Amino acid sequence: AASSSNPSDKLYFKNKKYYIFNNVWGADQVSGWWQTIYHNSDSDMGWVWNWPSNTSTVKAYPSIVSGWHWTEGYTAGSGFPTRLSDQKNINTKVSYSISANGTYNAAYDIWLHNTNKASWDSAPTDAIMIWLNNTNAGPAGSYVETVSIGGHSWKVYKGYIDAGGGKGWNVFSFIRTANTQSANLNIRDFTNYLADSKQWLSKTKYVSSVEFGTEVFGGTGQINISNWDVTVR
Amino acid sequence: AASSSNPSDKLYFKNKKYYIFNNVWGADQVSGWWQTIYHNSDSDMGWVWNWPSNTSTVKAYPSIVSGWHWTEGYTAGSGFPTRLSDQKNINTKVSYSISANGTYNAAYDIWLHNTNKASWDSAPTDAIMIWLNNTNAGPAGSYVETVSIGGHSWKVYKGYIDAGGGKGWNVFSFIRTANTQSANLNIRDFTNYLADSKQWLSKTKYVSSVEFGTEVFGGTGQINISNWDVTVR
Amino acid sequence: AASSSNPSDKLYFKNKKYYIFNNVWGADQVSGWWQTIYHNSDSDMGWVWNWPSNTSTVKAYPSIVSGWHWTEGYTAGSGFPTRLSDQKNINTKVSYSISANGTYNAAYDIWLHNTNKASWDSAPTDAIMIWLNNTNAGPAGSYVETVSIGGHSWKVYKGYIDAGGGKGWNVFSFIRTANTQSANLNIRDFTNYLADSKQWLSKTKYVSSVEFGTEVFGGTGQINISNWDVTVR
Amino acid sequence: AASSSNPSDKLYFKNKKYYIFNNVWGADQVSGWWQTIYHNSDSDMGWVWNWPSNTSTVKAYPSIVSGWHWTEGYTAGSGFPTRLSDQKNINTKVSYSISANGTYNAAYDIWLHNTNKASWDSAPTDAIMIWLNNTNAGPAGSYVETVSIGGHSWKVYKGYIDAGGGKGWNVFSFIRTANTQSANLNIRDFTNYLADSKQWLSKTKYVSSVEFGTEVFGGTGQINISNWDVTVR
Amino acid sequence: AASSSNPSDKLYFKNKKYYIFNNVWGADQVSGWWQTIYHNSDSDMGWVWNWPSNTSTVKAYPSIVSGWHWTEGYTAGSGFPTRLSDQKNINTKVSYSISANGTYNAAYDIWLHNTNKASWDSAPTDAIMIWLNNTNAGPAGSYVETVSIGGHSWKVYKGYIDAGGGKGWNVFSFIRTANTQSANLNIRDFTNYLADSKQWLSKTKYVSSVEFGTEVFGGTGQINISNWDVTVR
Amino acid sequence: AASSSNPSDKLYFKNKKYYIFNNVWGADQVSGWWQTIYHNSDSDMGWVWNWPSNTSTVKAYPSIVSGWHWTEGYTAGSGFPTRLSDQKNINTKVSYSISANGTYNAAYDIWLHNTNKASWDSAPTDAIMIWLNNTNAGPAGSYVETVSIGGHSWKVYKGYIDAGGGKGWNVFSFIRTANTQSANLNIRDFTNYLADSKQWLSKTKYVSSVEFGTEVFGGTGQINISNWDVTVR
Ligand SMILES: OC[C@H]1O[C@@H](O[C@H]2[C@H](O)[C@@H](O)[C@H](O[C@H]3[C@H](O)[C@@H](O)[C@H](O[C@H]4[C@H](O)[C@@H](O)[C@H](O)O[C@@H]4CO)O[C@@H]3CO[C@H]3OC[C@@H](O)[C@H](O)[C@H]3O)O[C@@H]2CO[C@H]2OC[C@@H](O)[C@H](O)[C@H]2O)[C@H](O)[C@@H](O)[C@@H]1O
Ligand SMILES: OC[C@H]1O[C@@H](O[C@H]2[C@H](O)[C@@H](O)[C@H](O[C@H]3[C@H](O)[C@@H](O)[C@H](O[C@H]4[C@H](O)[C@@H](O)[C@H](O)O[C@@H]4CO)O[C@@H]3CO[C@H]3OC[C@@H](O)[C@H](O)[C@H]3O)O[C@@H]2CO[C@H]2OC[C@@H](O)[C@H](O)[C@H]2O)[C@H](O)[C@@H](O)[C@@H]1O
Ligand SMILES: OC[C@H]1O[C@@H](O[C@H]2[C@H](O)[C@@H](O)[C@H](O[C@H]3[C@H](O)[C@@H](O)[C@H](O[C@H]4[C@H](O)[C@@H](O)[C@H](O)O[C@@H]4CO)O[C@@H]3CO[C@H]3OC[C@@H](O)[C@H](O)[C@H]3O)O[C@@H]2CO[C@H]2OC[C@@H](O)[C@H](O)[C@H]2O)[C@H](O)[C@@H](O)[C@@H]1O
Ligand SMILES: OC[C@H]1O[C@@H](O[C@H]2[C@H](O)[C@@H](O)[C@H](O[C@H]3[C@H](O)[C@@H](O)[C@H](O[C@H]4[C@H](O)[C@@H](O)[C@H](O)O[C@@H]4CO)O[C@@H]3CO[C@H]3OC[C@@H](O)[C@H](O)[C@H]3O)O[C@@H]2CO[C@H]2OC[C@@H](O)[C@H](O)[C@H]2O)[C@H](O)[C@@H](O)[C@@H]1O
Ligand SMILES: OC[C@H]1O[C@@H](O[C@H]2[C@H](O)[C@@H](O)[C@H](O[C@H]3[C@H](O)[C@@H](O)[C@H](O[C@H]4[C@H](O)[C@@H](O)[C@H](O)O[C@@H]4CO)O[C@@H]3CO[C@H]3OC[C@@H](O)[C@H](O)[C@H]3O)O[C@@H]2CO[C@H]2OC[C@@H](O)[C@H](O)[C@H]2O)[C@H](O)[C@@H](O)[C@@H]1O
Ligand SMILES: OC[C@H]1O[C@@H](O[C@H]2[C@H](O)[C@@H](O)[C@H](O[C@H]3[C@H](O)[C@@H](O)[C@H](O[C@H]4[C@H](O)[C@@H](O)[C@H](O)O[C@@H]4CO)O[C@@H]3CO[C@H]3OC[C@@H](O)[C@H](O)[C@H]3O)O[C@@H]2CO[C@H]2OC[C@@H](O)[C@H](O)[C@H]2O)[C@H](O)[C@@H](O)[C@@H]1O
Ligand SMILES: O[C@@H]1[C@@H](O)[C@H](O[C@H]2[C@H](O)[C@@H](O)[C@H](O)O[C@@H]2CO[C@H]2OC[C@@H](O)[C@H](O)[C@H]2O)O[C@H](CO[C@H]2OC[C@@H](O)[C@H](O)[C@H]2O)[C@H]1O
Ligand SMILES: O[C@@H]1[C@@H](O)[C@H](O[C@H]2[C@H](O)[C@@H](O)[C@H](O)O[C@@H]2CO[C@H]2OC[C@@H](O)[C@H](O)[C@H]2O)O[C@H](CO[C@H]2OC[C@@H](O)[C@H](O)[C@H]2O)[C@H]1O
Ligand SMILES: O[C@@H]1[C@@H](O)[C@H](O[C@H]2[C@H](O)[C@@H](O)[C@H](O)O[C@@H]2CO[C@H]2OC[C@@H](O)[C@H](O)[C@H]2O)O[C@H](CO[C@H]2OC[C@@H](O)[C@H](O)[C@H]2O)[C@H]1O
Ligand SMILES: O[C@@H]1[C@@H](O)[C@H](O[C@H]2[C@H](O)[C@@H](O)[C@H](O)O[C@@H]2CO[C@H]2OC[C@@H](O)[C@H](O)[C@H]2O)O[C@H](CO[C@H]2OC[C@@H](O)[C@H](O)[C@H]2O)[C@H]1O
Ligand SMILES: O[C@@H]1[C@@H](O)[C@H](O[C@H]2[C@H](O)[C@@H](O)[C@H](O)O[C@@H]2CO[C@H]2OC[C@@H](O)[C@H](O)[C@H]2O)O[C@H](CO[C@H]2OC[C@@H](O)[C@H](O)[C@H]2O)[C@H]1O
Ligand SMILES: O[C@@H]1[C@@H](O)[C@H](O[C@H]2[C@H](O)[C@@H](O)[C@H](O)O[C@@H]2CO[C@H]2OC[C@@H](O)[C@H](O)[C@H]2O)O[C@H](CO[C@H]2OC[C@@H](O)[C@H](O)[C@H]2O)[C@H]1O
């Protein structure tokens, strides 16, 4: 077992296919905070946080990463990158529980690029978010419609994140109409909706990453994850 | 942004008109505790605490200070001291939220003296408290009556705090009949009630300070303040 | 007052008749945790914890000890060891409150031996547990029946803890049918039930210890104890 | 074993004849600091500190206390108070080691009063300090002379500490001419010098306390004490 | 007094002309570290650190900033920006002491731009460093010569820092031939050497910032600063 | 990078061939301590500690493990267990630096068993220690002689560690006659000396583990390791 607390710390697991990532990307202008990632086993892991702030900015996204995350390449054995036109199933399973106050979510974050050689400075072209928990928060962009995908109902949002210099990505968010602590999803169901139903995503693009974590806007609490996997088949 | 954790630490803001004060005045005989003050912006600030104790003594009053607080003088630009007979409006606005357990309040603490040159050892003559939150607590002194002042209903209490050696002050507490997270008050409405309606306060006295904070008796939690000002007009 | 945080720390009180014990016996394979014991007075003491884990193993039993606990002997003035056949009253009083999440209990743990000279390596023969709080947990062994003892109703369980090498003890657990924050019990009522009603305990055995604490499986929180004593009469 | 870190925490030992005291009396106007007292056994105890400051004010005096220290009375079995005219031996033994930077001392602090019923607000009449270590520091008052007492050479200083309101005490400091890590002293040798040789102390006064600790002006480090006792015979 | 420990925290002082800055720019790929900035007064301030690493990368530059530092503008009253062709004196005074192990320096860092409206994304054109302490370190670029400027001898180095995308700055480092704890310097003496003696700097450029801090490569320790000012005249 | 601080935490590296181990085996009866293990890269790793105690007991052995350590089996790819009669080279390389006070060593710890299926409760038969640093410490057992092995001179000691119940192991310690920060050793040179020159070790035994770490008796400091490997060929 191990537990780490500095910015951008990584706890690898499953033969380095995944890592828990102490991602504090939104923290520069706030203080008073702490965030610790931990791994006891592959079925007992999570993170603990304290983000004292009332603002609507994301302070942090402690998370599990499979694939790329502004890294030189992709985690070993992850199955990323995978081109959408290859039509692989991207099967994910998670079971978790949160005890927290304030404003946060629990969400998948899926990154796409045009390149199959994403590196440390490769800006994504698109992000897909799948929120299993929304606690007092709301997504980027504008509400489109409610859809049934994968046996769940989702409110769909579409926006654009400007990352400076012409860098920036579409963001497509799927917010479950009620919170859930477990899901078994195929990311391909969501990318097929965006590509074939909405004509918002080209199948020439590559899925670079599947991440799962909690965006924290403010408050204190923790998550524990009791089941996790992402497999590209 | 900044966040500090030692006893009596001060985080100044608004051109040093105010400071957040890590006031732990009641802590000498307890242990196991911590208290951190933070300022991200003038609309995003607060404090976090842990006071493990069951007793009815106030352990701490983390707070924002305007004016005097056992200091050589008064914060710059605060407008203190102001003599009650000058009849200035003392307009205060606060919006806040607490997430905590145990026993605590959220309260204004207004200090008065006979002297307009209050220094580090000048014992006040009177304290006025205005409680916007009461969580399992109760004030000093005895219940007088319920009054409507400033558009709110308040239970009024009157007591006396003995500070040793003949030092000591009246304490007049106004406890809102239900908790609220925001208020816009004129302290003059409260001092006029005490002076003109109850004949308990001379208008020869000076208001030395307006403070807002949480008296903590026991438990753990935090406050965040999203709006704050005190202006003497 | 004092507050300590390392494994197996001890805070003695009442002329060393008792100690608060930072017992982390189940912690070897987990990380991310902390646990602090504190004593402000003999009527204001407790402990604070954070045990991030989903598993059904006991991580820790922060507790007050009277008597023996894998020590060379017994706390001074505790009245232990006492032979069951001497039929002494073992009167205990506790009042407490917990604020926590996760999975935990509040329980007496009473140790028995054949020897009246229990030492640091003397494996007990039996444990009796009396749970005043059960929060999402459950005991060792199998359910027997519900009984009224001492004015309370208890679900009774019987199991066996294997401690290796032939070492191991019976465990008899009494789980109150609803949680309570205070109790006045005579341990002799429980040992008489086990010995005379169930024929599960010989009165040749000695009571070595009476402990009270919280077994924590996972989560974060604290206890405060406002009344405590154990007296052998 | 135990280790505590809040202001004014106390770790009692030797049947409460002594306590280690987390004395931070000079800390109000500084920040960034920490101080922890610990006791593993009566021959393995000490404290650890960090006092980031360049100033000549004493920030803290972590110490062992026997007798009184602004308390209602005197530690049990200490032998205090003892009237100087009763001519008791006050035998002290200490062995210690410091590893630190900055500015500090290791010093006995002996308090005297006119009253044999010193209470929590009883201002002393005199202090005697016996410095076994001086690291970049210097005492209150003015240099008198160098004397041989008890087999050691001491630079003697005489000053007066003003504690406000007419409260205040003489301070007589004996600074060893070279540092030492161990000493066996009889306080009566020092009070006899002050009374009979210098005519600076009346034998009507009572010794209220013998304390040993490190005054820290700035820096970080620790002390460990391997032998300690004070006995009035 | 105050003391803060999160990345990029700021403690302003001197009417916000300066701030102490918890600058951890090189920390992304290391762990196990901490860094705290503190201010007791304008003559008693500093920082404490622990950077466990053997590598030659700068992990952090805790520092005092006057002027710009990837901010929207310049600190109030700093006197920045100032165009070199205006030939203002830029007088700096510092007195400090370090107690540390490992590899570090104590150095001024002076930033220049072509623009007098430097903003949060304005890459500098040049950096000038003035090292008062070198402990096991060495500068960027190549050694030029040893020069006497301002009454001190300096080893002069010239390099170029590539900041990506065409962004990047010359770096001119002046390393005192022996360490010193205090200096009174005029930055204009150094910019005149670079411009008029070496023809390496155009006087069309603006000085945007004067900073003083410790680049830490590895190790633990602290600095205390007892005198500080930067004035543009 | 990662850094962990709880007892028995593990940071695996090199495809789980090794782990850094937060081994605090001697800590039960002391307090005031902390110990953190960290890994930035395979050439930048180490640990930081604070063990306030004067006693001659080993408090902790933060270390890198290859092979077994009271585990069910041996680290993957370590090459353990290896039977001495197979005469494999066991080549080790380390380069490190310590900055610390107090009493400690830097030492290899090599464990042997009769069994090639060592499990979590398999008591070793022998330990071999190779001390590259001795700071105020001394080994178990009695001095034999000084020998030249592998190009270094070593003081050789022989003792026996009683682990209870008949469990216990020979301990053979080789203490370099002067400290060194780097070594390239073949463990077979040391086991051949013990077996063939001294007739103290049977070649039927298996090497189960090669560990390198710092036994800490007391004090505070850190190690950094810049090169590490153990290979069985
Ligand atoms: O160039 C220097 C080093 O760069 C490091 O990479 C950093 C990138 O430079 C950052 O852009 C990047 O930030 C992203 C962050 O990691 C994501 O988790 C976050 O995800 C958002 C997503 O954008 C959003 O659309 C969706 O709805 O929600 C998710 C989950 O929260 O996106 C961040 C992108 O930020 C850009 O766009 C938004 C603007 O507000 C922002 O200013 C833009 O930057 O982060 C990486 C990693 O480092 C940082 O994040 C983790 C922190 O712990 C760390 O402290 C940060 O530095 C490379 O890894 C290094 O190699 C380079 O040296
Ligand atoms: O003389 C040495 C240094 O004194 C410092 O001033 C301290 C005073 O000496 C204390 O009396 C004072 O305590 C008061 C505290 O700051 C207030 O917040 C508190 O407010 C109460 C109020 O009285 C009560 O009536 C109302 O209902 O609730 C409010 C909010 O909680 O009142 C305290 C007064 O205490 C006296 O009366 C009650 C008795 O129980 C008590 O024993 C009496 O003392 O505090 C100041 C500031 O320092 C202390 O408080 C803040 C802590 O963080 C710090 O550790 C404490 O020292 C000067 O500032 C220094 O310059 C002097 O050197
Ligand atoms: O031999 C080396 C040192 O031993 C120390 O004694 C330890 C014993 O060796 C451990 O067996 C013992 O663990 C017990 C623990 O302290 C109890 O609180 C716990 O109580 C359980 C009870 O068994 C259970 O039946 C009931 O329902 O719930 C209670 C309350 O939680 O029982 C533990 C017994 O563990 C054994 O059986 C179960 C197996 O899972 C386990 O592996 C077995 O060991 O603990 C003592 C004290 O030290 C340890 O516990 C406290 C921690 O803080 C510390 O870190 C641990 O070492 C001696 O005290 C030393 O003198 C010896 O040198
Ligand atoms: O009235 C409220 C509570 O008071 C508490 O008692 C405090 C006294 O009020 C303080 O005066 C006292 O401070 C003294 C300190 O404890 C001593 O260790 C120190 O010793 C000096 C000595 O004077 C000096 O002459 C010699 O050379 O060096 C020694 C060792 O360092 O003296 C302090 C006296 O301070 C007065 O005089 C000097 C002035 O600068 C100063 O302002 C004056 O006050 O301390 C006690 C104990 O509490 C405080 O100290 C320990 C801290 O941890 C704690 O945070 C502080 O409050 C009672 O104990 C309570 O019951 C009362 O409610
Ligand atoms: O765009 C997102 C946010 O950017 C923030 O500004 C950051 C810049 O983006 C970084 O380039 C900048 O890093 C510099 C750092 O602050 C300086 O102190 C350092 O100074 C060096 C100097 O270059 C060197 O030449 C000299 O010899 O030594 C000094 C003292 O150490 O230079 C850093 C420049 O880094 C670039 O070039 C070198 C490359 O290795 C590197 O990758 C390049 O980036 O830092 C600012 C401030 O934030 C960061 O630094 C402080 C940290 O605490 C913090 O965590 C970091 O983010 C804006 O302030 C935000 O508004 C933007 O949203
Ligand atoms: O049975 C319950 C759990 O046991 C765990 O294994 C522990 C063993 O039970 C302990 O005996 C073992 O302690 C040894 C320690 O890990 C070694 O590093 C140490 O090495 C010494 C060596 O003996 C000495 O001869 C040489 O000169 O120096 C080295 C380096 O310091 O030896 C310890 C052996 O201790 C025994 O003999 C000496 C007696 O004083 C002592 O009382 C005896 O016990 O440790 C393991 C691992 O856990 C413990 O150590 C690491 C700590 O972080 C942790 O907190 C401790 O529990 C199993 O791993 C679990 O699966 C079992 O459930
Ligand atoms: O998934 C994140 C998403 O939740 C966040 O939504 C923002 C949205 O972009 C913005 O337009 C709107 O003003 O605020 C949203 C967050 O606020 C909501 O949740 C928090 C509650 O406290 C609020 O009350 C509620 O309204 O957008 C970020 C991406 O942010 C980046 O792009 C947009 C910029 O405004 C930010 O500065 C960037 O960091 C998603 O990651
Ligand atoms: O505003 C504070 C006020 O709440 C506090 O009230 C005391 C009151 O003075 C006392 O008479 C009574 O016994 O206890 C009150 C606090 O208890 C209540 O709130 C906490 C809950 O746990 C309790 O159950 C509930 O009854 O008084 C302090 C001032 O205290 C000082 O003067 C009175 C002395 O008794 C104290 O020792 C002094 O510190 C207000 O600041
Ligand atoms: O008092 C402790 C008791 O609560 C614990 O019960 C175990 C029981 O022994 C085991 O058979 C069963 O599988 O799990 C019980 C705990 O789980 C329950 O509470 C926690 C919730 O999260 C679960 O959902 C709920 O089912 O037993 C320990 C003693 O444990 C030791 O003996 C049994 C072994 O399995 C352990 O490894 C030993 O440590 C009591 O102290
Ligand atoms: O034992 C303490 C004693 O060391 C301290 O000495 C002061 C002395 O009272 C003062 O006159 C002089 O200016 O400074 C002395 C301390 O400075 C010396 O040691 C620290 C080094 O950094 C300096 O360079 C060196 O000169 O006095 C205190 C008592 O202080 C109280 O009375 C005097 C007042 O000035 C203080 O404010 C009071 O707190 C002894 O406890
Ligand atoms: O002031 C910093 C300066 O000291 C640092 O010098 C580097 C130099 O740029 C590089 O060429 C050389 O390899 O290492 C120097 C540091 O090493 C020396 O000091 C540390 C000791 O441990 C070493 O033994 C000793 O040789 O350069 C940075 C700027 O760094 C940036 O540009 C150069 C890139 O290599 C870095 O990645 C960048 O961050 C100055 O801020
Ligand atoms: O490698 C460890 C070894 O250094 C330690 O040596 C002990 C030796 O066993 C004991 O006979 C002697 O009294 O003390 C040695 C340590 O003391 C020396 O180093 C520390 C300095 O402070 C001292 O001044 C100096 O003399 O032995 C342990 C193993 O210890 C176990 O067996 C022996 C028992 O006495 C212990 O209780 C056991 O833990 C080696 O791991």
Side-chain angles (χ1 to χ4, degrees), chain E residues 28-33 50-55 59 101-102 219-220, chain F residues 1-3 36 38-40 43-45 48 99-100 222 224-226:
Chain E
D28 292 344
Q29 301 184 271
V30 300
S31 188
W33 61 262
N50 176 43
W51 286 103
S53 179
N54 64 43
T55 70
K59 307 312 183 294
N101 63 25
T220 316
Chain F
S3 66
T36 291
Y38 73 92
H39 180 272
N40 300 327
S43 67
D44 187 32
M45 63 184 158
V48 190
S99 294
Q222 70 188 290
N224 175 89
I225 295 169
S226 65

Side-chain angles (χ1 to χ4, degrees), chain C residues 1-92 94-233:
Chain C
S3 66
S4 201
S5 303
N6 293 110
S8 299
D9 290 353
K10 298 177 177 178
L11 296 172
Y12 292 88
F13 65 104
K14 199 78 78 201
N15 195 209
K16 302 184 73 179
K17 187 184 171 182
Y18 311 124
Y19 53 95
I20 316 176
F21 186 36
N22 204 25
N23 180 342
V24 296
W25 69 269
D28 292 344
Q29 301 184 271
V30 300
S31 188
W33 61 262
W34 49 261
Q35 190 173 277
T36 291
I37 56 167
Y38 73 92
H39 180 272
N40 300 327
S41 74
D42 297 350
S43 67
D44 187 32
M45 63 184 158
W47 47 89
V48 190
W49 67 85
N50 176 43
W51 286 103
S53 179
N54 64 43
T55 70
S56 68
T57 65
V58 174
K59 307 312 183 294
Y61 181 57
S63 46
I64 305 168
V65 173
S66 191
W68 169 97
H69 189 93
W70 282 268
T71 47
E72 178 41 60
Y74 309 80
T75 58
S78 60
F80 302 110
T82 186
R83 211 181 203 170
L84 289 176
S85 57
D86 290 331
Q87 285 291 304
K88 304 214 153 35
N89 295 304
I90 304 175
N91 296 130
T92 68
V94 69
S95 298
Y96 75 93
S97 63
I98 296 171
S99 294
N101 63 25
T103 299
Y104 58 86
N105 64 35
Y108 284 93
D109 204 27
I110 301 118
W111 292 112
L112 301 92
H113 290 86
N114 287 315
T115 186
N116 66 347
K117 295 294 192 268
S119 190
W120 64 272
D121 55 357
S122 303
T125 56
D126 306 84
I128 300 169
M129 306 197 80
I130 308 175
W131 302 28
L132 300 184
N133 179 297
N134 184 6
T135 299
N136 304 308
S142 289
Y143 176 67
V144 182
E145 68 198 1
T146 299
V147 305
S148 182
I149 298 175
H152 300 259
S153 296
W154 310 96
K155 300 171 283 188
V156 178
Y157 298 78
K158 180 179 187 298
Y160 177 78
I161 306 298
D162 187 333
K167 299 180 318 292
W169 43 91
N170 303 301
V171 54
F172 307 99
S173 304
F174 296 81
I175 296 180
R176 201 177 180 270
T177 55
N179 295 341
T180 191
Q181 291 188 145
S182 70
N184 200 307
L185 304 173
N186 185 350
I187 302 313
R188 191 182 76 178
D189 295 343
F190 295 81
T191 58
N192 278 350
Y193 161 83
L194 294 170
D196 296 329
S197 300
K198 309 304 292 185
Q199 301 82 220
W200 286 343
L201 187 62
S202 173
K203 297 192 189 180
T204 59
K205 289 169 170 181
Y206 290 89
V207 178
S208 306
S209 178
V210 173
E211 314 185 358
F212 178 81
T214 58
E215 295 186 297
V216 181
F217 301 83
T220 316
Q222 70 188 290
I223 193 167
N224 175 89
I225 295 169
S226 65
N227 194 43
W228 169 255
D229 262 321
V230 182
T231 311
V232 178
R233 305 280 195 192

Side-chain angles (χ1 to χ4, degrees), chain F residues 19 30 70 83 85 138 155 160 208 233:
Chain F
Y19 53 95
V30 300
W70 282 268
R83 211 181 203 170
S85 57
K155 300 171 283 188
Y160 177 78
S208 306
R233 305 280 195 192

Side-chain angles (χ1 to χ4, degrees), chain E residues 104-108 128-149 152-158 171-180 185 190 193 215 217:
Chain E
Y104 58 86
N105 64 35
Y108 284 93
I128 300 169
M129 306 197 80
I130 308 175
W131 302 28
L132 300 184
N133 179 297
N134 184 6
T135 299
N136 304 308
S142 289
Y143 176 67
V144 182
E145 68 198 1
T146 299
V147 305
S148 182
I149 298 175
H152 300 259
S153 296
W154 310 96
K155 300 171 283 188
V156 178
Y157 298 78
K158 180 179 187 298
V171 54
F172 307 99
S173 304
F174 296 81
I175 296 180
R176 201 177 180 270
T177 55
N179 295 341
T180 191
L185 304 173
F190 295 81
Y193 161 83
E215 295 186 297
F217 301 83

